[PDB]
DNA sequence: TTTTTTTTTTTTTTTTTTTTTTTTTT
DNA sequence: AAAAAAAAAAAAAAAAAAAAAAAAAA
């Protein structure tokens, strides 16, 4: 299999387009990356019309020789790391599913499915409710729910890409000495980032984009998102990651997350209106008024 | 083997036989490949390598080769191509495909053959001056498309089968104008029934068109001449019925029984097989420039666009470069630039469509260079149509219904607004026009569509067009002591559809007159018509452009085309309260004292102008500067159309919004 | 004066059918 | 003497719909 997003349930062009690794290695958010991808597809010998067809209805001859075409061409563009081995499960005259696609469908089912304290309580209740929707999809009898999860995953990844290009083009990322800050205050569809998993998706997109950047640094990142209804920011701290294909000389116990201790230290000393109640200690909910001072304290906190 | 010196001497008393000899055709191919690989221009960059690189990216099937390049070096091959096109083109296509398979190996799975499109042939003929000496040679002819047959599949490798011997005949290349005639069998040794060998065959796209002579070329008062042109694959549907085109092709002859029967002499029919197509509809810049499309860009040109797009004050230079020889009238130039770049159309949930084009009106005194500005807009725009006054009708700016001469069914034909889809329609002397003809554009100005219900045809067309109109006030001159509604005859329904209105007044001022006269006299002095010399001409023509144009016009045309084609800015973060307050104030100050209709339709024009100013910078997001500039433009367009009594108060009242 | 009214002007043939009666052609 | 193929033979035309002029008037 390949490090491609939902290959067997979408086109080949879509799989190459919405991939974190390909986007990091080719910078598809601007025009140059799209032109480079078109040049690659032209060189490989696959017509642009054929690469946009559904996987089931794709040409048999092209599908048969995909491995050789990948092996002989992927090295020129630095994408030789997309080839790997995985696990594929098939049940009768139904169709093949890979483990990666299954976990993305499950995550999509988790994310979307189905006076401020009550507002937060209803959101948490819906998040609890989504658990049974994800639970039902593990049974072989309920395949329509798995298909629904696949569609939801496609839509969610499209939204993440759309937000990420806006973040990257306007230079919203601010490089402080200790960490890198990104606060999303205005824009469309900020109601998708009230869920921690969607913000983790966007953070994984940004970290993947930064890891392959020629700039050599390992600073942690802070991602903040506003909810108008609750007037609260949801703030998450994300650890840096080494490049995927880098050697094992640096390999060790991975970089440690130090945001929990810093958040507890700042919360204890000052009477900030923060909520640290999630299982993940790196995700907090801070009132709108306290965001700008609190972060300043974090700048002097250290351990980051 | 032979040498380029040895191709000069000719044998067989015919050039075609000399070219088709096996030893000559091996030197020709090598020389053509060396020309393709090793040619460099003045700057030192190989152009055909870049063209081949772009070909695979775009999944193109054709290559464009300039005749001047192949004539400057290897002139013998240029002469051979000029005299004998058919045999040279077969070899040149093969060498082109071989050169293409050096950048994109395995490209044969996309396209199996590469076609070559010749450009900039030196000699241009008219249809009236074609004679028999031009038979079987490459020619360049201008004309006007009249009628188009439509696309049908045509056989490429024709096969035959004979039953009594069961023989299958080898593939035959069809002439595309003469039916393949076979009567002898290699095996049957006698006449036998021949089948078409059903299935297992290769087809091509075929189309036919008729070119009349252009009215400008035809001598005044004489009948035009027409000819037939065959368009093969990759060239179908490029030309449209009504456009004016230039075709490079091969002039051929064929035997027709009816022509011999009627005339009474053994005369032959002629037809042109098209090789290259260039559009000339609205183009007056055909005097210079090289290529098949002057609105297309290369990679280095796109890089230069992105380089000059990040300079501060690009909008100011773009505005200053509009109609450079006209002095003053900067608001008109700003409106023209905003209309040229345009806005962004929108569709909300697939049920609510919002227009994204800016319309401009110019109402002014005589002798203020409005028509010259319209002509400049016609020249710069990619697609432009021109009309004036009583010379246009209700169905001449719209779709008409005609009986097809062949099919004999009622059919729809195009018009001025349809010929300028995604373009500009210019209407000079817009007030000296019938009301029935003027009211035909009401649907196209806002809904951007045309609906016809005539003679059993019930259809809706699409006209995404922008209108820049010029008019004269009542009495020929503007009374500044009167409101707008009494200086024009147009009513509210047509005045609301315009985005920007420019009132041009001529006033007595000694210093202004002196400056205008000095500028005009200097312009007349400049325009007086009295290494390689052909590049000395270019450098001298650039020196004159240096003074009054911050950027060259040829660069600006491609800049505008690229900006319109690629960029689509959005409005994520912006100040809603300022726009709401401005709209409410404008609505209040209209009924109280004013005669300029303001509705919800004028709220969206500010956003459209903001998106246009964002496009000017090649940015994907609208900033605060662009929105403020749009608000300032809209406010200045409203204040200066008032009476002299209340203008000073209105300007002061509206001055808080435009602080910058 | 800008409205309504008015004549009027090409628009047409591209197709059909099985006999019946002729010339070539083994 | 007996087959297979190949043309002649058309005729017809009024009746309606759409678009641009060159004379009439509130
Ligand atoms: N700054 C200028 N202002 C006005 N006219 C200018 C200027 N510079 C040059 N001219 C010349 O003055 C002449 C008058 O221009 P033009 O014919 O366009 O006037 P107009 O009254 O707007 O025309 P029309 O009635 O055809 O719309 C033109 O020959 C034009 O080139
Ligand atoms: Zn035979």
Element (H, E) at B469: strand B465-471
Answer whether B512 contacts ligand 1 (Cβ < 6 A): no
Closest Cα to residue B321, out of B307, B336, B343?
A: B336
Burial of A271 (0-12, 13-18, 19+ CB in 10 A): exposed
Q: Tell me if B201 sits within 8 A of B159, measured CB to CB.
A: yes
Contacts of B290 by beta carbon, 8 Å cutoff, 6+ apart: B66, B68, B119, B120
Å: B179 CA to D3 C1': 30
Helix ranges (DSSP H) in B342-404: 370-380
CA distance B271 to B48: 32
Q: Which atom of ligand 1 is nearest to the CA of B366?
A: 21
Measure CA to C1' and name the residue nearest C14: B406
Q: What part of A 45-64 touches B (C-beta under 8 Å)?
A: 45-49
Burial of A236 (0-12, 13-18, 19+ CB in 10 A): buried
Instruction: Answer whether residue B617 is part of any domain.
Output: yes
Which residue pairs from B11-18 have beta carbons closer than 8 angstroms and sit at least 24 positions apart in sequence?
Answer: B15/B80, B15/B83, B15/B84, B16/B84, B16/B87
Closest Cα to residue A184, out of A242, A144, A134, A223?
A: A223
Burial of A205 (0-12, 13-18, 19+ CB in 10 A): buried
Q: Are residues B92 and B148 in the same domain?
A: no
In chain B, what is the straight-line distance between the N-terminal and C-terminal CA atoms, in Å?
Answer: 76
Instruction: Answer whether residue B15 is part of any domain.
Output: no
CA distance A10 to A151: 10
CA distance B144 to B210: 8
Instruction: Answer whether residue B239 is part of any domain.
Output: yes
Domain edge (last residue) among B202, B232, B260: B202
Hey, what are B405's tokens?
Answer: 């001469």
Q: What are phi and psi of A25, to 5 degrees?
A: -80, -15
How far away, in angstroms, is B171 Cα from ligand 2 center? 16
B90 conformational bin, left if phi > 0, alpha if psi -120 to 50, beta if neither: alpha
In chain A, what is the straight-line distance between the N-terminal and C-terminal CA atoms, in Å?
Answer: 37
Torsion, Cα B385 B389 B395 B399, to 10 degrees, reads: 20
Q: What is the DSSP letter of B236?
A: T
CATH number of B401's domain: 3.40.50.300
Q: Are residues B51 and B197 in the same domain?
A: no
E strand segments, B10-111: 62-66
Q: Which atom of ligand 1 is nearest to the CA of B365?
A: 21
Element (H, E) at B64: strand B62-66
Is strand D within 7 Å of residue B389 (CB)?
A: no
Answer whether B368 contacts ligand 1 (Cβ < 6 A): yes
Is strand D within 7 Å of residue B393 (CB)?
A: yes
Burial of A38 (0-12, 13-18, 19+ CB in 10 A): middle
Closest Cα to residue B554, out of B244, B298, B279?
A: B298
Is strand D within 7 Å of residue B394 (CB)?
A: yes
**Nearest residue of A to residue B571, measured between CA atoms:** A187
Q: Are residues B370 and B501 in the same domain?
A: yes
Å: B494 CA to D16 C1': 36
Instruction: Answer positive or negative: Cα dihedral of B80, B82, B83, B86.
Output: positive
Instruction: Answer whether residue B286 is part of any domain.
Output: no
Q: Which residues on A lie below 8 Å from B106 (Cβ)?
A: 44-45
Hey, what are A259's tokens?
Answer: 């945001």
Q: What are phi and psi of B91, to 5 degrees?
A: -65, -40
Hey, what are B64's tokens?
Answer: 């464009």
Test mutation, A42, A46, A226, chain B, max B CBs within 10 A: A42
Element (H, E) at B173: strand B172-173
Q: How many CB atoms lie within 10 A of CB B39?
A: 18
Burial of A292 (0-12, 13-18, 19+ CB in 10 A): exposed
Residue found by looking up tokens 């299958």 in the block: B168
Q: Which residues pair with B467 in a beta bridge?
A: B425
C-alpha B124: how far from chain center: 20
Hey, what are B135's tokens?
Answer: 């038979």
Closest Cα to residue B65, out of B228, B378, B276, B355?
A: B276
3-state DSSP call for residue B457? Answer: strand
C-alpha B577: how far from chain center: 42
Hey, what are B258's tokens?
Answer: 């009816």
Nucleotides of C under 7 A from a protein CB: 2-4, 11-15, 26
Question: In chain B, which residues are followed by a C-to-N distance beyond 2.5 Å, i.e. a gap?
Answer: 530
Q: Which residues on A lie below 8 Å from B107 (Cβ)?
A: 42, 45
The verdict on a CB contact (< 8 Å) between A31 and B566 is: yes
Q: Are residues B316 and B416 in the same domain?
A: yes
Q: What is the DSSP letter of B361?
A: E
Q: How many CB atoms lie within 10 A of CB B369?
A: 18
Hey, what are B216's tokens?
Answer: 């400008």
Q: Tell me if B116 sits within 8 A of B214, measured CB to CB.
A: no
Q: Are residues B162 and B107 in the same domain?
A: no
Half-sphere exposure for A223 (CA within 13 Å, toward CB): 23
Element (H, E) at A283: strand A283-287
Q: How many CB atoms lie within 10 A of CB B405?
A: 7
Helix ranges (DSSP H) in B420-464: 435-438, 442-446
Contacts of B20 by beta carbon, 8 Å cutoff, 6+ apart: B87
C-alpha B305: how far from chain center: 20
Q: For chain B, how big is the Rg over CA atoms in Å?
A: 30
The verdict on a CB contact (< 8 Å) between A47 and B566 is: no
Q: Tell me if B569 sits within 8 A of B621, measured CB to CB.
A: yes
Contacts of B257 by beta carbon, 8 Å cutoff, 6+ apart: none
Q: CA dist B37 to B99, B213, B317, Å?
A: 8, 39, 39
Helix ranges (DSSP H) in B342-412: 370-380
Closest Cα to residue B581, out of B643, B637, B635, B500?
A: B635
C-alpha B224: how far from chain center: 25
Q: Tell me if B230 sits within 8 A of B272, measured CB to CB.
A: yes
Hey, what are B223's tokens?
Answer: 């009948």
Closest Cα to residue A31, out of B563, B609, B423, B340?
A: B563
Instruction: Answer positive or negative: Cα dihedral of A270, A275, A280, A283.
Output: negative
Q: Tell me if B269 sits within 8 A of B253, measured CB to CB.
A: yes
Q: What are phi and psi of B437, to 5 degrees?
A: -75, -35
Is strand D within 7 Å of residue B454 (CB)?
A: yes
**Nearest residue of A to residue B100, measured between CA atoms:** A43
Q: Are residues B62 and B132 in the same domain?
A: no
Torsion, Cα A270 A272 A277 A278, to 10 degrees, reads: -100
CA distance B512 to B515: 5
Cα angle B287, B288, B289 (rounded to 5 degrees) comes to 140
Q: Which atom of ligand 1 is nearest to the CA of B371?
A: 18
3-state DSSP call for residue A279? Answer: coil
Of B59, B107, B621, the CB nearest to A48: B59
Task: Tell me the angle at which helices A196-211 and A144-169 cross, rounded to the nearest 10 degrees.
Answer: 50
Instruction: Answer whether residue B6 is part of any domain.
Output: no
Q: Tell me if A262 sits within 8 A of A298, measured CB to CB.
A: yes
Test mutation, B59, B306, B563, chain A, max A CBs within 10 A: B59
Helix, strand and coil content of chain A, in percent to the nearest 5, comes to 50, 10, 40
Q: Which residues pair with B20 in a beta bridge?
A: none
Helix ranges (DSSP H) in B219-369: 257-263, 299-308, 314-320, 330-341
CA distance B212 to B233: 23
Q: How many CB atoms lie within 10 A of CB B469?
A: 25
Contacts of B69 by beta carbon, 8 Å cutoff, 6+ apart: B39, B47
Hey, what are B503's tokens?
Answer: 């009132």
Hey, what are A91's tokens?
Answer: 């049940």
Instruction: Answer positive or negative: Cα dihedral of B219, B220, B226, B230.
Output: positive
Q: Are residues B58 and B107 in the same domain?
A: yes
Closest Cα to residue B413, out of B399, B425, B403?
A: B399
Range of the domain at B29: 22-123
Q: What is the DSSP letter of B171?
A: P
CATH number of B37's domain: 3.30.1640.10
Domain edge (last residue) among B167, B202, B237: B202
Shortest distance, CA B275 to any CA of chain A (angstroms): 26
3-state DSSP call for residue A194? Answer: coil
Number of domains in chain B: 4
Hey, what are A208's tokens?
Answer: 């993947």
Half-sphere exposure for A62 (CA within 13 Å, toward CB): 21
Q: What are phi and psi of B353, to 5 degrees?
A: -105, 135
Q: What part of B 110-129 touches A (C-beta under 8 Å)?
A: 110
Q: Are residues B209 and B336 in the same domain?
A: no
Closest Cα to residue B255, out of B245, B265, B244?
A: B265
Task: Tell me the angle at which helices A259-269 and A291-301 cross, rounded to the nearest 10 degrees.
Answer: 120
Q: Are residues B271 and B398 in the same domain?
A: no
Instruction: Answer whether residue B287 is part of any domain.
Output: no
The verdict on a CB contact (< 8 Å) between B572 and A45 is: no
- Which method, experimentally, gave rise to this model? cryo-EM
Contacts of B141 by beta carbon, 8 Å cutoff, 6+ apart: B124, B125, B126, B127, B130, B211, B227, B246, B247, B248, B249, B272
Hey, what are B357's tokens?
Answer: 């084009």
Closest Cα to residue A268, out of A302, A294, A304?
A: A294
CA distance B151 to B207: 5
Q: How many CB atoms lie within 10 A of CB B449?
A: 13
Q: Which residues on A lie below 8 Å from B572 (Cβ)?
A: 166, 186-188
Torsion, Cα B451 B453 B458 B462, to 10 degrees, reads: -20
Closest ligand to C-alpha of residue B516 is 1
How far away, in angstroms, is B339 Cα from ligand 1 center? 21
DSSP string, B413-429: E--HHHHTTTEEEEEES
Q: CA dist A15 to A3, A11, A20, A98, Å?
A: 9, 6, 10, 14
Q: Which atom of ligand 1 is nearest to the CA of B519?
A: 8
Q: Kind of pairing, strands B465-471 and B360-364?
A: parallel
Q: What is the DSSP letter of B543?
A: H
Shortest distance, CA B176 to any CA of chain A (angstroms): 28
CA distance A235 to A129: 23
CA distance B492 to B480: 20
Q: Tell me if B229 sits within 8 A of B271, measured CB to CB.
A: yes
Shortest distance, CA A150 to any CA of chain B (angstroms): 22
Å: B149 CA to C11 C1': 21
The verdict on a CB contact (< 8 Å) between B57 and A39 is: yes
DSSP string, B511-568: HHHHHHHHHHHHHHHHT-----HHHHHHHHHHHHHHHH-SS-HHHHHHHHHHHHHH--
Q: Are residues B196 and B233 in the same domain?
A: no
Domain edge (last residue) among B202, B237, B260: B202
Of B56, B57, B572, the CB nearest to A188: B572
Q: CB of A187 within 8 Å of any CB in chain B?
A: yes
DSSP string, A60-120: HHHHHTHHHHHHHHTTTTT-GGGB----EEE-SSS-EEEHHHHHHHHHHHHHS----HHHH
Q: Which atom of ligand 1 is nearest to the CA of B364?
A: 22
Q: Are residues B243 and B339 in the same domain?
A: no
Q: For chain A, how big is the Rg over CA atoms in Å?
A: 21
Test mutation, A30, A34, A43, chain B, max B CBs within 10 A: A43
C-alpha B542: how far from chain center: 24
3-state DSSP call for residue B278? Answer: strand
Instruction: Answer whether residue B452 is part of any domain.
Output: yes
CA distance B87 to B250: 12
Q: Are residues B168 and B149 in the same domain?
A: no
**Across all strands, nucleotide nearest B436 (CA–C1'):** C3
Q: Kind of pairing, strands B423-428 and B465-471?
A: parallel
CA distance A18 to A40: 16
Instruction: Answer whether residue B398 is part of any domain.
Output: yes
Burial of B193 (0-12, 13-18, 19+ CB in 10 A): exposed
E strand segments, A119-241: 174-175, 180-184, 221-227, 232-238
């Amino acid at each position: 299999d390949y490090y491609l997003f939902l290959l067997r349930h979408s086109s080949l062009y879509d799989s190459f387009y919405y991939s974190n690794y390909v986007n990091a290695k080719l910078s598809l958010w601007n025009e140059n990356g799209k032109k480079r991808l078109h040049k690659m597809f032209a060189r490989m010998g696959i017509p642009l019309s054929t690469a946009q067809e559904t996987w089931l209805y794709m040409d048999h001859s092209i599908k048969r020789e995909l491995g050789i075409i990948f092996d002989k061409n992927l090295d020129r563009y630095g994408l030789q790391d997309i080839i790997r081995d995985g696990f594929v499960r098939t049940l009768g005259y139904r169709g093949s599913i890979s483990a990666s696609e299954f976990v993305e469908a499950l995550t999509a089912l988790l994310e979307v499915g189905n006076n401020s304290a009550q507002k937060l309580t209803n959101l948490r209740k819906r998040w609890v409710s989504n658990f049974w929707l994800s639970w039902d999809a593990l049974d072989d009898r309920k395949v329509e729910l798995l298909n629904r999860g696949i569609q939801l995953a496609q839509d969610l990844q499209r939204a993440i890409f759309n937000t990420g290009v806006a973040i990257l083009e306007k230079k919203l990322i601010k490089h402080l000495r200790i960490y890198r800050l990104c606060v999303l205050q205005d824009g469309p569809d900020l109601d998708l980032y009230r869920n921690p998993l969607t913000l983790l998706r966007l953070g994984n997109w940004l970290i993947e984009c930064c890891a392959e950047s020629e700039d050599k640094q390992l600073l942690p990142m802070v991602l903040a998102s506003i909810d108008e209804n609750t007037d609260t920011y949801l703030v998450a701290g994300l650890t840096p990651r080494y490049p995927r294909g880098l050697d094992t000389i640096h390999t060790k116990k991975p970089i440690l997350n130090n945001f929990s201790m810093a958040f507890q230290q700042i919360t204890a000393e000052t009477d900030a209106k923060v909520r640290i109640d999630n299982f993940e200690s790196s995700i907090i909910e801070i009132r709108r008024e306290d965001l700008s001072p609190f972060l300043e304290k974090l700048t002097l906190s250290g351990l980051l | 083997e032979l040498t380029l010196e040895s191709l000069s001497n000719v044998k067989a008393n015919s050039y075609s036989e000399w070219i088709t000899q096996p030893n000559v055709s091996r030197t020709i191919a090598r020389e053509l490949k060396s020309f393709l690989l090793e040619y460099t221009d003045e700057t030192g960059r190989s152009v055909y390598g870049a063209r081949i690189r772009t070909l695979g990216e775009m999944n193109s099937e054709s290559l464009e080769v300039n005749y001047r390049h192949l004539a400057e070096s290897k002139a013998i091959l240029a002469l051979f191509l000029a005299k004998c096109p058919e045999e040279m083109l077969k070899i040149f296509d093969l060498v082109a495909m071989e050169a293409t398979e050096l950048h994109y190996p395995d490209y044969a799975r996309i396209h199996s053959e590469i076609h070559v499109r010749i450009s900039d042939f030196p000699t241009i003929y008219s249809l009236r001056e074609l004679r028999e000496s031009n038979l079987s040679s490459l020619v360049r002819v201008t004309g006007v498309v009249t009628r188009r047959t439509g696309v049908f599949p045509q056989l490429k490798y024709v096969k035959f089968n004979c039953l009594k011997c069961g023989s299958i005949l080898g593939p035959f290349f069809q002439d595309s104008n003469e039916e393949i005639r076979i009567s002898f069998c290699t095996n049957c040794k006698s006449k036998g029934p021949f089948r078409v060998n059903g299935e297992k065959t290769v087809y091509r796209n075929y189309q036919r068109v008729t070119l009349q002579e252009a009215p400008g070329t035809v001598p005044p008062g004489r009948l035009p001449r027409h000819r037939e042109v065959i368009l093969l694959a990759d060239l179908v549907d490029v030309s449209k019925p009504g456009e004016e085109v230039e075709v490079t092709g091969i002039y051929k002859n064929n035997y027709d029984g009816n022509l011999n029967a009627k005339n009474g002499f053994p005369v032959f029919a002629t037809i042109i097989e098209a090789n290259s197509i260039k559009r000339r509809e609205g183009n007056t810049a055909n005097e210079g420039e090289e290529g098949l499309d002057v609105f297309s860009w290369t990679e280095e040109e796109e890089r230069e666009f992105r380089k000059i797009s990040r300079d501060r004050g690009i909008i100011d230079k773009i505005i200053s470069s509009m109609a450079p020889s006209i002095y003053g009238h900067r608001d008109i130039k700003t409106a023209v630039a905003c209309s040229l770049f345009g806005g962004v159309p929108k569709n909300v949930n697939g049920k609510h469509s919002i227009r994204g084009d800016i319309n401009v009106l110019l109402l002014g005194d005589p002798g203020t260079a409005k028509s010259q500005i319209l002509k400049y807009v016609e020249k710069t725009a990619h697609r432009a149509v021109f009309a004036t006054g009583q010379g246009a009708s209700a169905v001449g700016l719209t779709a008409s219904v005609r009986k097809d001469p062949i099919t004999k069914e009622w059919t729809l034909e195009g018009g001025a607004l349809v010929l300028a889809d995604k373009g500009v329609c210019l209407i000079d002397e817009f007030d000296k026009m019938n009301d029935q003809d003027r009211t035909s554009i009401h649907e196209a100005m806002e809904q951007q569509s045309i609906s016809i219900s005539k003679a059993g045809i019930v259809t809706t067309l699409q006209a995404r067009c922008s209108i820049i109109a010029a008019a004269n006030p009542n009495g020929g001159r503007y009374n500044s002591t009167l409101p707008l509604a009494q200086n024009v005859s147009l009513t509210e329904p047509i005045l609301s559809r315009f985005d920007i209105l420019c009132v041009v007044r001529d006033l007595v001022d000694e210093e202004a007159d002196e400056r205008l006269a000095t500028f005009v006299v200097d312009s007349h002095v400049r325009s007086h018509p009295e290494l390689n010399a052909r590049q000395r001409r270019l450098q001298r023509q650039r020196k004159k452009e240096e003074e009054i144009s911050p950027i060259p016009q040829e660069l600006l045309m491609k800049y505008i085309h690229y900006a319109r084609t690629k960029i689509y800015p959005k409005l994520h973060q912006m100040d809603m309260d300022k726009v709401s307050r401005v709209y409410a104030d404008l609505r209040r100050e209209s009924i109280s004292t004013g005669s300029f209709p303001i509705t919800v339709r004028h709220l969206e024009s500010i956003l459209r102008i903001a998106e246009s100013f964002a496009k000017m910078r090649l940015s994907e997001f609208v900033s605060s500067y662009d929105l403020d500039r749009a608000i300032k433009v809209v406010v200045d367009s409203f204040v200066d159309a008032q009476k002299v009594s209340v203008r000073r108060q209105l300007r002061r009242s509206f001055a808080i919004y435009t602080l910058g």
